[PDB]
Design a protein around this ligand. Sequence first.
Ligand code: 8V5
Ligand code: ZN
Length: 257
Amino acid sequence: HWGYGKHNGPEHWHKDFPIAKGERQSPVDIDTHTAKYDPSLKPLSVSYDQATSLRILNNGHAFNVEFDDSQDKAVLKGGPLDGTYRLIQFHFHWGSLDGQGSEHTVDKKKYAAELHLVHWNTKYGDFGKAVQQPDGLAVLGIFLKVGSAKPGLQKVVDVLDSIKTKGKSADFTNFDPRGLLPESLDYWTYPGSLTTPPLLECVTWIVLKEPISVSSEQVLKFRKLNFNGEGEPEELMVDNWRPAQPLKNRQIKASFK
Ligand SMILES: NS(=O)(=O)c1ccc(-c2cnc(C(=O)N3CCOCC3)o2)s1
Ligand SMILES: [Zn+2]
């Protein structure tokens, strides 16, 4: 019953999920002047060359491109992380308009969308166990702005017709997530949470400073998705983002001077 409407949206989540008001909630505003460069942060290691995508799913909140995470095939390492985190899925959050849509903000600036590459700590055996741990997940966040098209996003865009409504899925093999990365891997990092219910406080957030550009046509196709199931009243899947939450007792660290 939670969602993003006037009656079930982020302001309501705390009633079913009291951790919504917790001590390490995401997303947050990234105050670029207050984030501290941390020279002890390792370079980030993104190893996606062996990635195996399987499926794309409209889950009624966003769409997930899911990966085979039954072996170490696509991993995130280094940066603030100890150990090996395996890619399980990626998805996006986006707006009804180019001026909003991202979950994280940068000096209060909202981007048109935000990509989340979700990884789980292999020390915990599977995703389900990992989300119960303070260091269970690493989500790589990448901002999208509207400008030139992102060629590597287009295979995703073109399959969206086939998963228009909640619960629809489609085969989605041989998609290469390296096509969605910016040039630079400079990042901010802080400890936080899933940004949707159950809002578990299990994520090390790694948010890239460099946005990717997508075209107006690409983002328009995101906005044609539906929150509803087939044969239900059409509600466009837009504004599926949670706003910035209080930073509280946390420091955001920068990987770069
Ligand atoms: N916006 S976010 O913070 O990146 C995020 C919010 C919720 C996520 C979630 C929950 N379950 C999964 C998942 O991929 N699985 C694993 C178990 O639940 C169903 C499928 O992802 S990922
Ligand atoms: Zn997300």
